[PDB]
């Protein structure tokens, strides 16, 4: 007979990213207008500029 | 045009606020080494005839 339904393009809820990602803000449907997170290289094991 | 300029300036001032700050915590953590062999200090001293 004719094939009424055979699978199809499927929709998945979540897009899980395996690669570890640096901290960020919302940039999808919700966009955050504030300043991006400030990266400070605190806690230096050896003195460099003091 | 003046209203547009004023609103742009106000928008920039409002957007100047910052969200948060990120940093790494690493003080006090050192690396480690692996000692391969146990340092025994024993030496056997025997006479020539074995007495």
UniProtKB/TrEMBL annotation, chain A:
Organism: Banna virus (BAV)
Protein name: Vp2
Covered residues, full protein: 52 to 101 of 955
């Amino acid at each position: 007979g004719e094939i009424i339904y055979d699978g199809g393009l499927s929709s998945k809820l979540a897009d899980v990213v395996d690669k570890t990602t640096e901290p960020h803000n919302a940039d999808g449907a919700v966009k955050d207008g504030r300043i991006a997170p400030v990266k400070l290289d605190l806690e230096k094991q050896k003195l460099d500029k003091l | 045009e003046d209203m547009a300029k004023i609103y742009g300036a106000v928008a920039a001032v409002s957007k100047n606020v910052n969200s948060s700050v990120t940093y790494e915590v690493k003080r006090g953590t050192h690396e480690l080494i692996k000692v391969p062999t146990i340092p025994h200090n024993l030496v056997l001293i025997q006479s020539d005839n074995g007495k």
